[PDB]
């Protein structure tokens, strides 16, 4: 079991350089039975292999990108990294790091462990953290014994925000909607959870809103009105 | 490079069904072929490597892969709700490694009507000069639905947006949220706010009065 941790999402300006780092835990990056690579997925599209590195520094690049990409490795800190020069909006995508094993006989490579993915947005606008508003339950949001509550996450840039409830302890009944692009060029989304209306006098429900591009987290206790 | 294709690009199938997906290479790739399962919002997960070997944590008798050369199949036995995902093949014989475009596997289930909830703007937001009214359609099937806003019984256009989840991995339903955005000024000139959802021959409207 490996865990691969990428640096978080953010903005990169047109024509500047995207830079990402993956930290490997659960095993050494100095392994003669692994390479280490980067893959990306444009929003709504499929997957493209960017390139790979062996723990000695040898590198392998997709020729659709070989001019602009550099991958490097730091065995001392169990890290490897990716630089992508002169970016455009064609480079906006979720970038994944991955360990690359293979199945003998032959070098039948596979991607067996993956990072969580980091969304990179190429854009001229600046970042804006979100404003968070409660969507509050009452008798008027109670279907028999089940109430809906949520929070409205308004006016942020770039994507993504992630939302959890009660620090991730509450997961079933949660729906976090895809963000919408508003005419101001800022995003909004909402996240809701359904809970027994009899619990609203007793249990605390807190929506946890994380906006890594602005290094902001917002926690909002959502109360019946 | 080696072009990978998949068929079909999407399918729907019922729970318990047997589902087969096809991958083709435009050049032989021997057995150097992997299958990945990507669920919504997650990284792809290796399911099959070397064309036919199972990743060691995958439960037996649920997935199998076969083929060689240019034609490969992934088979899902006894489709389950949690198998909702996009499935990608990927070849490792020629560099650059290339993925197929993916096959989305949707789940067919019985109709479910939505639970409908409407939330007035928070007083927090109103202090700020805008008012977002939110309509929630929770856990319905099938996906298609018309959502409309009415303010003092007058139908709205161009001042709302909507968002739909992917199919739930446990009960295979959808949920949807619609947001009507007004100026605080506009919001306080009207009394009745209503969200109306239509599927087939049934409409459900939830409303509130700005006063109460």
């Amino acid at each position: 079991q490996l865990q691969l941790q990428e640096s978080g999402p953010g903005l990169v300006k047109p024509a500047e350089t995207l830079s990402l780092t993956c930290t490997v835990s659960g095993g050494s990056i100095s392994s003669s039975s692994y390479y280490w690579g980067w893959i990306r997925q444009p929003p709504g599209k499929g997957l493209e292999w960017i390139g790979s590195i062996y723990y000695t520094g040898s590198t392998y690049y997709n020729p659709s990108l070989k001019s602009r990409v550099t991958i490097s490795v730091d065995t001392s800190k169990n890290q490897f990294s990716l630089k992508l020069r002169s970016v455009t909006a064609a480079d906006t995508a979720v970038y994944y790091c991955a360990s690359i094993g293979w199945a003998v006989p032959g070098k039948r490579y596979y991607f067996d462990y993956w990072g969580q993915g980091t969304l990179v947005t190429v854009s001229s606008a600046s970042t804006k953290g979100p404003s968070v508003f409660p969507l509050a339950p009452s008798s008027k949001s109670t279907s028999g014994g089940t109430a809906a509550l949520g929070c409205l996450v308004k006016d942020y840039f770039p994507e993504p925000v992630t939302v959890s409830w009660n620090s991730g302890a509450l997961t079933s009944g949660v729906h976090t909607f895809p963000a919408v692009l508003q005419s101001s060029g800022l995003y909004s989304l909402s996240s809701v959870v359904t809970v027994p209306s009899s619990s609203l006098g007793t249990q605390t429900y807190i929506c946890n809103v994380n906006h890594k591009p602005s290094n902001t987290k917002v926690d909002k206790k959502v109360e019946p009105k | 490079d080696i072009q990978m294709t998949q068929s079909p690009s999407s399918l729907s199938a019922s729970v318990g069904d047997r589902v087969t997906i096809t991958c083709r290479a435009n050049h032989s790739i021997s057995s150097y072929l992997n299958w990945y399962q990507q669920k919504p919002g997650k990284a792809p997960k290796l399911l099959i490597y070397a064309a036919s070997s199972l990743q060691s944590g995958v439960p037996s008798f649920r997935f199998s892969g076969s083929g060689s050369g240019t034609d490969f199949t992934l088979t899902i036995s006894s489709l389950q709700p949690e198998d909702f995902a996009t499935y990608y093949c990927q070849q490792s014989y020629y560099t650059p490694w290339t993925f197929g475009p993916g096959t989305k596997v949707d789940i067919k289930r019985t109709v479910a009507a939505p639970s409908v909830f409407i939330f007035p703007p928070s007083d927090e937001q109103l202090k700020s000069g805008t008012a977002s009214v939110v309509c929630l359609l929770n856990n319905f099937y099938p996906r298609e639905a018309k959502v409309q806003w009415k303010v003092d019984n007058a139908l709205q256009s161009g001042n709302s947006q909507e968002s739909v989840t992917e199919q739930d991995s446990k009960d295979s339903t959808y949920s949807l949220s619609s947001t009507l955005t007004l100026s605080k000024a506009d919001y306080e000139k009207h009394k009745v706010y209503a969200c109306e959802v239509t599927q087939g021959t049934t409409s459900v409207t939830k409303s509130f009065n700005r006063g109460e």
């Binding site: 062996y54 690359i100 293979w102 070098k107 | 150097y32 014989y93 020629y94 560099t95």
Partner: peptide, 8 residues
């Protein structure tokens, strides 16, 4: 990494 199919 080095490919078996096109090792050039």
């Amino acid at each position: 990494q080095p490919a078996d199919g096109n090792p050039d």
